[PDB]
Design a protein around this ligand. Structure first.
Ligand SMILES: Nc1ncnc2c1ncn2[C@@H]1O[C@H](COP(=O)(O)OP(=O)(O)O)[C@@H](O)[C@H]1O
Ligand SMILES: Nc1ncnc2c1ncn2[C@@H]1O[C@H](COP(=O)(O)OP(=O)(O)O)[C@@H](O)[C@H]1O
Ligand SMILES: Nc1ncnc2c1ncn2[C@@H]1O[C@H](COP(=O)(O)OP(=O)(O)O)[C@@H](O)[C@H]1O
Ligand SMILES: [Mg+2]
Ligand SMILES: [Mg+2]
Ligand SMILES: [Mg+2]
Ligand SMILES: [Mg+2]
Ligand SMILES: [Mg+2]
Lengths: 525, 526, 106, 211, 538, 49
């Protein structure tokens, strides 16, 4: 080998060896990730080096948590990572389609066919499939029912059915709460907080915020009914001079005077807060809650607690925006000009204690544009799994809202695209018809894997579904209970249009790029 | 005792003679053979494993060559010339290596035939001069005002890459970026795509969504949530100095002996921040971009005037913004003037892509800098697309600087080879044989194109040479796809004259340099 | 016993269960008591214990002798603990508690 | 993991689809090696032993025996090819090619969850039908000198180059016709093959006697 | 023909140290076996006749106890399925405080019966569905089995009788005395407001006199000694300070600038006079006990001794807050004298020695206050730790009783009744899930079987008698540990009772853990790393 | 993504110390080079000189 001739300690795989290595890696990934597809898939349990336990079903999480050191596996992992980052779904389908595309290409490549013709056929088939996907999508006004159906089709695949049913309501309600008219949805306005005391079905939606910290002074009220919210980012603790001043005195009395006078700067701001609290509410019915992004020294805590003010310190940076949107106040970086107009309102604030941790609830807001989901469960891995599931559901609902089109699921669109590609195949000149056929067969993997995971056999279920679609023309998928063809649109099995488009584009691009690779080199040492 | 005595230090190896020349030429040949199959529109791709753990799925010759480690110094020289060709013109990296390998291959025949290398070098230099003359002769002019011709040139430059599937979009992006970057101040023409044509790769989406913005895009967000994220016609002020209260350069110590001095010092810190912010506000801007931190009190004072602020920005991004919106970076806001205020940006929008916030200053009128937003399958695909876009932009700038074109697909190689062969018939000395040898060695480009196309090399090369022996056949090459001879006046494959000249010069001078070498000495430490 | 590809407890964990474990515990308690048997009564004898550094301790008190004995047997340490308890609460009888406990177990 | 590994910790086990993958990979590797041997246009391989002996060959059996392989399925295929060479004397490369292609085609359907038993049943039925068709298609002809020369050509032209095969055809046909007795089995032990190392490869010939 | 190579694909791509288990036999059966092994390991400690276990952790710290949660915590469990079951047991401990051994035993029995169900042919999904249905049926049935209510939480006798059963399993020899102690301690706490705090009960372990000498104190005990001359106060007027008992200093930088001889000669005298004035001002409020969380200055101590002020220093801020709650004072940030509302009062504060340990006692006389302390005697540190664990269990039982005042019969009667009812329900359920429902019902037998095995009698005879008595109608009849032969008796009359919340949460958590273990089909274990713990645990 | 595995098939089944050169560049050119080197070593002793 030439590369070995220059660098003796270099590993090279040339031409057919390179193709075999790539196809083997893709096939191994495909056989591992086959069982993830569908709600009837099998949970995978993942133990890290430190012994942490991870139960999950996501394709991306699984790929990240497998102990693999393969280049093609790394490329597919990057593709799935991009898929998850943008759309949040389809990673398992991504890996399955990439592997099946590579296998179908190899079927014809082993017969002496050059991969370039296969890639050209793949390009033509991808264009035709994209046209068909544009043709087949269903434009619907996204009411609550359709969003609930989409969230179910995601969560049921990602989590237990009953927990999925709870998470559907939670996710859809949160999304509808934070969404404004014709304005892009900011998912940062939904806080996903984890508590580890109750059961997994106790996860719910709070129309407000939950903070993982509470008041640091024991005398502060644990529960205030009607509260004014003061969201601020002003330090209330002692701060050094930037110029390294230090003090000089000649007697104990002078030292006492300097000690008393050195707190005046902080005391002025505490006095401003206290004066505003006195002005806004002169009775004990109303309450005052101070949430500060900066720390508060014990002296200011005592001064505030003497005035019946609940003060939370060291809040999260994003919590400033979340409180501003939910409570309705104004986040202040200084107290130079503070007015009652900048105060938010909360209909109930209380502190909940859980072991060593301490939590604060802010609910009963007027019209909260930012809400929080309280993930509850008995185990850490349960919380992680629920967090991944709710992330997937939020992404799916946001994608469905973004474009008013939704695509029927259960593999119906895959079968329809396969038949359309087969019909279009004669229109393709040259030997690219083989590539088009390979692309169609690769697209047919989703119903195959769904039927295989559901317990039925691939051939009979696939031919039944294909015959039904051909004779009727409807979009018929896979019934995971009976195995018979079924109209996914009528039963509520929906899939994101953007997810399908990204799947087609990314899978075709990565498969074409891998097919044309004829040499793997490691000569950087 | 009595350790051995000797003249040179230990581990000081030395080789000399015909063995050294044979080894050098073999190393050059093997380097050429490493990337021989990565030439032409039907070139296969390669997967380079970065020792850091990354993967480089690339077709560019220089990208492949610079990712490998070699021990033979001749291979090091080959890598260096590949890098030189890449930097000088932008493309042609995998052609100059092949040409140099072939020239050394045909020189080895004469070095084995009792011919001193100096005669071969003289013949090579004469051949290079005549190659340059012939290339300048068969060139054709191009009017840069024609958009279609420029797009065709860029396409012919990118048919051999992985971006040829989206060739129209890639050509439009490259041409727009190069034209937008073009600038001239104080009577000095300048096309600086390295600093002002920025390529930003964001994985995801589809490659058809990639475009070139009339502005600058950065991975930034507003410091405070209440600050505006959408402004129609912003007035931009750029700063490269902190808006905070920092210590002075000279050592300074305060001595507090009075009660009210500590609070007075803190109040003066606040007042200094307020005065700085008021100096900023006096120009009435809409957004403020700083390369250094902005204090929270400064944020509040700016927000009081309804001003958006981006906290920390790299120097290059700030320079790009200044070019795009016509601003001027200043350091002391008390000296801020109306001229430094950046007007010209037509929209500043801070939208969310995936799970990250990105700041757009697009919709500028007459911007001198741009960002090429690339969206694709993954990081490696985007990296390859960026490499292809770099090649396209380099070719576009080469054409803009030199509007001369020469036929591609080996037509220029065959024409120059035939011209050299015809000229050599007047030669009578011993120098003619290496002259003709390098003349026909220049034919390695069409041979490599035919080999990569899969067609039969011998009969196609014979027919092409016979065609080039005719009178008006200087533009006859080979199809990289169908493997058939075709006139390039009708195929449309043309490459810049500067690229071809640089490739030929680099190949010939590399051959000269490696032929001037004997008596390799190694082992001495620094 | 079977290899059990993934073992339940940490490798090297040592376990003992049943009547033999209790009998071994009783024997260890008897061994501990034997170290202070002779230090009881007017005709008692002193004990000399040398630490790692080399300092020697000559004592007749049962609690001191047991403390100087770096006992690591979990069941045997109970006698040392009760000797310390008797020394703390009362101050005399540190040998008697150990002798009585060992004799009960025997 | 596996029961055998539990009983024998230092044991190697391949179960379920793993065994099929291993066997099919071995068969496909052997087939890929031996593709370039079939036909007179097949490439010629040179094999170097440990001692440095050079052996140019194109036979399937010779290549299999002198090829550095330590795989079980390869061992089974080598044994089958050895028996094929021992009894019939020809058709060793075709044996490996057909076995590998059979396994690959079977995998093509097994990968869709099909049990291998169905594929084996189909294989047996197809074998019966193919044997019937082979009985139908064979050409029963009185073996004169021309037919024997044609068969010797069809073998040696694959084994060696043109002129050498032409010489060997006459040599072997004449030898067989010389030793053959009517209505008696041919005793191939009566053709002593002697090696001399002093002339060109085309100087080999048949001697109507003994050396 | 000598080695079996790795199959192409995932097997070859796996890392050097990783492990991949997939399928029924390779993963699910192994997980079930590990969980059953852990359950059997902890099994022998169940019930009043449970046997203590000596556990030596990695730091050679010795634990002897029959508490399942403590044993699991001190055991270096490595099988991740057993880790999940242990985490379920720990969650049960945190949520309720008792029933961890019940959780472990139920999970083990459920997984064993799940394994046999998988062996006979049932799929994993059917087993999971049947277990969930049976768990729902059990939760529906459970409220009907409530026999009696707490009906009073301010009575010493009734609370002691209620808590007696919870602390019979631990320290079976002497549970009446401990029940009385914990009842008194919990009744001093739990004021008119229904809220009850577990942390308001403090446990002090002073070695020397045997656990029969323990007592409950309506106050706080600190294992230290006074820093001043005064060692006893009869009308304590404690003034609690969080700042160090010294003249406060500037936080920026202190520098005594001296420019004349007069300032140098008068600085120390002025500082002394200021300290004396501050101490006298503090003492003039009537305060006679001063508690500080910081260091005590020598001059401040001298002037406190001059004015007869008792000094106690509490380094821990938790103890300072607990003392503030106990007395009723507010930790003053500065050294200013306390106004009358924020000055705590205690009926008696004195320095005393218990055994050989010097303690400071903040003693009340009324049977009230925010915090009550249980001083524990004993002859061994391990014995006092076990008694502390028993007290913790009793306190959690009282807290549960405050949360819900419903009880179920103990001694295995509830488990037998639940098993009978669930079996009857499953006998009327057509479909494949009847096997899973019946197995879930049978899994309840592990509790009375464990009780019988630990008590030394034949489990089968006990279970047969329990079925006979429950079938004839008696629902409150359970195992009788006070017999040499298999015998049963009514548990309601005998007073053995269990909290409804404990059984409810234990059943729910055990079922959830078993189902979660069953749901796992593939395991991918990374190469173990022998790191010195993650930084999160510190 | 730091090690190139051996291709499935004959590449993996090859013995530990064996070598396999196939194709034009790996076999024919190398053999021609070796023969050229041998001829080069013997060349200088040809003829009376
Ligand atoms: N209830 C259902 N019935 C039939 N098919 C379903 C049902 N739910 C989901 N599917 C199909 O199964 C697939 C689920 O794949 P999933 O596990 O979500 O992979 P990914 O997470 O990579 O998208 C979807 O493509 C959908 O078409
Ligand atoms: N469609 C085509 N048909 C024939 N030759 C082509 C075609 N496109 C490009 N070429 C030739 O291929 C060469 C470009 O190959 P490329 O991979 O870019 O190598 P380099 O990077 O060294 O230029 C040019 O010299 C051009 O003449
Ligand atoms: N006097 C008794 N007679 C019979 N059984 C009892 C008696 N006291 C308690 N039990 C039983 O012992 C069980 C308590 O076991 P225990 O060791 O406390 O485990 P856990 O701590 O996990 O609850 C209860 O279920 C109860 O039925
Ligand atoms: Mg999904
Ligand atoms: Mg190029
Ligand atoms: Mg004595
Ligand atoms: Mg043959
Ligand atoms: Mg208990």
């Amino acid at each position: 080998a030439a590369v070995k001739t220059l660098n003796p300690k270099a590993e090279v795989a040339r031409a057919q060896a390179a193709l075999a290595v790539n196809i083997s890696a893709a096939r191994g990934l495909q056989d591992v990730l086959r069982t993830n597809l569908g709600p009837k898939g099998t949970m995978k349990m993942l133990v890290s080096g430190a012994g942490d336990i991870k139960l999950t079903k996501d394709g991306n999480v699984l790929l990240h948590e497998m102990q693999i050191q393969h280049p093609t596996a790394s490329l597919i992992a990057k593709v799935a990572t991009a898929q998850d980052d943008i759309t949040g779904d389809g990673t398992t389908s991504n890996v399955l389609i990439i592997g099946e595309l590579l296998k179908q290409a190899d079927l014809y490549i082993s017969e002496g066919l050059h991969p370039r013709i296969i890639t050209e056929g793949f390009e033509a088939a991808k264009e035709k499939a994209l046209q068909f996907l544009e043709e087949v999508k269903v434009s619907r006004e996204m009411d609550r029912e359709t969003l609930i159906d989409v969230a179910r089709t995601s969560l049921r695949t990602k989590v237990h059915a009953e927990l999925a049913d709870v998470l559907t309501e939670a996710v859809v309600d949160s999304i509808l709460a934070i969404k404004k008219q014709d304005e892009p949805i900011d998912l940062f306005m939904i806080e996903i907080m984890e508590m580890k005391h109750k059961s997994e079905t106790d996860t719910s939606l709070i129309r407000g915020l939950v903070l993982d910290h509470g008041a640091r002074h024991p005398d502060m009220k644990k529960r205030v009914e009607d509260a004014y919210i003061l969201t601020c980012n002003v330090s209330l603790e002692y701060e050094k001079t930037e110029v390294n001043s230090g003090f000089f005195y000649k007697s104990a009395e002078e030292r006492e005077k300097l000690v008393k006078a050195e707190r005046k700067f902080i005391e002025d701001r505490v006095k401003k807060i206290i004066e505003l609290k006195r002005k806004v509410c002169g009775d004990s019915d109303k309450g005052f809650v101070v949430i500060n992004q900066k720390g508060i020294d014990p002296f200011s805590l005592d001064a505030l607690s003497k005035e019946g003010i609940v003060a939370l310190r060291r809040a999260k940076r994003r919590n400033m925006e979340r409180l501003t949107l939910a409570c309705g106040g104004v986040a202040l970086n200084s107290f130079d000009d503070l007015s009652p107009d900048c105060l938010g309102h909360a209909g109930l604030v209380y502190e909940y204690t859980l072991g060593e941790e301490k939590f604060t609830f802010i609910e009963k807001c007027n019209n909260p544009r930012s809400v929080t989901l309280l993930i509850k469960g008995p185990n850490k891995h349960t919380l992680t799994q629920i967090k991944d599931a709710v992330r997937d559901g939020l992404r799916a609902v946001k994608n469905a809202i973004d474009d008013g089109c939704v695509v029927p699921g259960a593999g119906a669109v895959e079968v329809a695209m396969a038949e359309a590609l087969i019909k279009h195949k004669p229109s393709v000149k040259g030997r690219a018809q083989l590539g088009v056929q390979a692309f169609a067969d690769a697209l047919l993997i989703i119903p195959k894997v769904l039927a295989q995971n559901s317990g039925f056999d691939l051939q009979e279920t696939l031919v039944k579904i294909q015959a039904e679609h051909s004779e009727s023309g409807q979009l018929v998928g896979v019934d995971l209970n009976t195995g018979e063809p079924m109209v996914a649109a009528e039963v509520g099995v929906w899939d994101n249009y953007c997810v399908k488009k990204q799947l087609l584009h990314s899978c075709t691009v990565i498969a074409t790029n891998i097919l044309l690779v004829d040499e793997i080199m490691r000569a950087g040492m | 005792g009595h350790r051995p005595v000797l003249v040179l230090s230990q581990n000081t190896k030395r080789e000399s003679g015909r063995k050294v020349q044979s080894g050098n030429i073999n190393a050059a040949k093997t380097i050429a053979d490493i990337i021989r199959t990565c030439l032409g529109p039907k070139s296969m791709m390669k997967m380079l494993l970065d020792p850091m753990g990354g993967i480089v799925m690339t077709n560019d010759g220089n990208a492949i060559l610079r990712e490998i480690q070699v021990q033979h110094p001749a291979a090091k020289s080959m890598i260096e010339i590949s890098r030189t060709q890449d930097e000088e013109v932008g493309d042609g990296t995998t052609s100059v290596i092949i040409l140099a390998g072939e020239m050394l291959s045909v020189a080895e025949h004469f070095l084995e035939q009792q011919m001193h290398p100096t005669v071969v070098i003289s013949a090579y230099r004469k051949a290079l001069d005549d190659m340059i003359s012939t290339l300048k002769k068969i060139s054709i002019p191009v009017d840069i005002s024609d958009s279609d011709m420029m797009l065709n040139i860029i396409n012919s430059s990118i048919t051999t890459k992985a971006i040829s599937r989206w060739s129209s979009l890639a050509c439009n992006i490259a041409l727009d970026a190069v034209k937008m970057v073009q600038f001239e101040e104080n009577g000095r023409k300048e096309i600086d795509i390295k600093k002002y044509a920025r390529v930003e790769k964001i994985p995801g989406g589809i490659i058809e969504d990639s475009c070139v913005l009339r502005g600058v895009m950065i991975n930034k967000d507003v410091t405070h949530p209440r600050m505006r994220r959408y402004i129609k016609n912003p007035r931009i002020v750029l700063l490269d100095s902190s808006l905070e209260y920092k210590k002075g350069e000279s050592q300074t110590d305060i001595e507090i002996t009075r009660e009210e001095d500590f609070t007075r010092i803190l109040q003066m810190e606040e007042e200094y921040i307020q005065q700085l912010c008021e100096d900023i506000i006096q120009l009435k801007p809409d957004v403020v971009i700083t390369e250094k931190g902005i204090s929270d009190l400064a944020q509040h004072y700016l927000m009081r005037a309804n001003i958006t602020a981006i906290r920390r920005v790299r120097k290059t991004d700030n320079n790009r913004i200044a070019r795009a919106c016509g601003a001027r970076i200043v350091s002391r806001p008390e000296e801020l003037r109306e001229d430094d205020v950046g007007t010209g940006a037509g929209l500043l929008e801070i939208k969310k892509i995936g799970d990250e916030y990105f700041t757009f200053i697009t919709d500028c009128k007459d911007p001198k800098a741009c960002t090429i937003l690339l969206r694709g399958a993954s990081k490696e695909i985007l990296s390859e697309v960026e490499r292809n876009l770099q090649d396209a932009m380099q070719v576009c700038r080469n054409v803009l600087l030199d509007p001369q074109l020469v036929p591609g697909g080996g037509a220029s190689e065959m024409a120059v080879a035939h011209a050299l062969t015809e000229k050599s018939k007047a030669m009578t000395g011993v120098e003619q044989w290496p002259y003709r040898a390098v003349a026909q060695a220049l034919e390695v480009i069409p041979r490599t194109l035919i080999q990569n196309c899969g067609a039969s090399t011998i009969r196609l090369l014979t027919s092409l040479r016979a065609k080039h022996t005719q009178e008006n056949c200087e533009t006859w090459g080979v199809n990289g796809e169908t493997g058939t001879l075709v006139d390039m006046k009708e195929l449309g494959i043309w490459e810049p004259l500067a690229v071809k000249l640089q490739t030929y010069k680099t190949a010939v001078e590399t051959a000269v340099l490696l032929l001037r070498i004997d008596d390799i000495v190694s082992g001495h430490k620094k | 016993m079977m290899p059990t590809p993934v073992i339940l407890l940490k490798e090297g964990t040592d376990s003992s269960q049943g009547i033999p474990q209790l009998v071994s515990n009783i024997s260890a308690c008897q061994v501990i008591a034997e170290a202070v048997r002779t230090t009881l009564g007017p005709r008692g004898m002193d004990k000399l214990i040398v630490d790692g550094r080399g300092k020697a301790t000559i004592s007749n008190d049962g609690a001191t002798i047991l403390k100087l004995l770096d006992v690591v047997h979990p069941a045997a340490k109970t006698l040392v603990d009760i000797a310390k308890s008797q020394d703390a609460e009362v101050g005399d009888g540190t040998t008697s508690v150990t002798l009585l406990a060992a004799e009960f177990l025997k | 993991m596996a029961a055998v590994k539990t009983l024998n910790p230092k044991a190697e086990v391949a179960r379920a689809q793993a065994a099929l993958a291993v066997n099919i990979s071995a068969a496909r590797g052997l087939q890929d090696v031996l593709r370039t041997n079939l036909g007179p246009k097949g490439t010629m391989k040179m094999l170097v032993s440990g001692a440095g002996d050079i052996k140019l060959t194109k036979d399937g059996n010779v290549l299999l025996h002198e090829m550095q392989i330590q795989h079980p399925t390869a061992s089974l295929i080598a044994k089958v090819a050895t028996a094929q060479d021992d009894i019939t004397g020809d058709g060793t490369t075709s044996n490996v090619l057909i076995i590998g292609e059979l396994l690959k085609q079977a995998d093509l359907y097994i990968s869709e969850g099909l049990h291998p038993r169905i594929i084996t049943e189909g294989f047996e039925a197809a074998k019966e039908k193919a044997l019937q068709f082979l009985e139908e298609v064979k050409v029963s002809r009185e073996m004169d000198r021309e037919t024997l020369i044609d068969v010797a050509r069809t073998s040696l032209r694959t084994k060696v180059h043109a002129e050498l095969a032409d010489v060997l055809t006459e040599a072997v046909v004449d030898s067989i016709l010389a030793i053959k007795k009517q209505d008696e089995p041919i005793d191939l032990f009566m053709i002593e093959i002697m090696e001399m190392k002093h002339k060109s490869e085309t100087d080999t010939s048949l001697i109507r006697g003994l050396v | 023909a000598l080695h079996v190579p790795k199959a192409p694909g995932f097997a070859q791509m796996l890392k050097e140290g990783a492990k991949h288990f997939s399928g029924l036999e390779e993963a699910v059966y192994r997980n079930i076996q590990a969980c059953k092994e852990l359950a059997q390991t902890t099994r022998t400690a169940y019930g009043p006749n449970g046997m203590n276990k000596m556990v030596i952790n990695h730091l050679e710290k010795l634990f002897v106890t029959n508490d399942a949660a403590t044993i699991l915590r001190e055991l270096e469990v490595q099988h991740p399925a057993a880790k999940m079951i242990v985490m379920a047991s720990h969650m049960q401990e945190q949520e309720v405080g008792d029933g961890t051994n019940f959780v472990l035993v139920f999970a083990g029995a459920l997984l064993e019966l799940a394994e046999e169900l998988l062996r006979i042919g049932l799929s994993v999904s059917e087993v999971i569905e049947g277990y969930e249905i049976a768990c729902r049926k059990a939760h529906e049935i459970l409220p009907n089995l409530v026999c009696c209510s707490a009906k009073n939480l301010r009575d010493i006798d009734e609370v002691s009788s209620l808590l007696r059963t919870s602390i019979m399993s631990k320290q079976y020899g002497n549970e009446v005395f401990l029940a009385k102690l914990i009842a008194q301690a919990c009744v001093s706490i739990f004021p008119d407001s229904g809220h009850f705090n577990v942390d308001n009960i403090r446990v002090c372990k002073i070695l020397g006199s045997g656990i029969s000498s323990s007592s409950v104190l309506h106050g706080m005990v600190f294992k230290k000694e006074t820093e001043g001359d005064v060692t006893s106060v009869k009308d304590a007027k404690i003034a609690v300070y969080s700042c160090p008992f010294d003249g406060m200093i500037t936080e920026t930088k202190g520098t005594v600038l001296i420019k004349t001889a007069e300032e140098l000669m008068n600085f120390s005298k002025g500082e002394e006079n200021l300290m004396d004035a501050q101490v006298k001002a503090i003492a003039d409020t009537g305060a006679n006990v001063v508690v500080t969380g910081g260091k005590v200055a020598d001059m401040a101590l001298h002037y406190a001794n001059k004015y007869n002020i008792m000094l106690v220093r509490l380094n821990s801020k938790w103890d300072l807050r607990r003392l503030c709650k106990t007395v009723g004072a507010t930790a003053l940030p500065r050294l200013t004298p306390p106004v009358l509302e924020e000055m705590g009062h205690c009926d008696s504060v004195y320095l005393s020695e218990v055994g050989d340990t010097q303690v400071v006692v903040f003693k009340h006389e009324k049977e009230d206050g925010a915090i009550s302390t249980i001083v524990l005697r004993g002859s061994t540190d391990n014995l006092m730790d076990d008694i502390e664990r028993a007290v913790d269990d009793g306190v959690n039982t009282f807290k549960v009783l405050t949360r819900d005042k419903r009880l179920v019969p103990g001694g295995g009667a509830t488990e037998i009744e639940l098993a009978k009812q669930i079996t009857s329900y499953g006998e009327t359920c057509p479909g494949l899930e009847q096997y899973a429902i019946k197995k879930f019902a049978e899994a309840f037998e592990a509790i009375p079987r464990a009780l019988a095995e630990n008590s030394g009698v034949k489990a089968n005879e006990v279970i047969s008698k329990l079925y006979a008595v429950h079938q004839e109608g008696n629902k409150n009849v359970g195992l009788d540990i006070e017999a040499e032969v298999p015998a049963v008796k009514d548990m309601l009359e005998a007073g053995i009772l269990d909290t409804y919340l404990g059984k409810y949460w234990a059943i729910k958590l055990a079922t959830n853990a078993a189902v979660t273990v069953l749901r796992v089909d593939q395991i991918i274990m990374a190469k173990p790393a022998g790191g010195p713990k993650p930084p999160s645990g510190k």
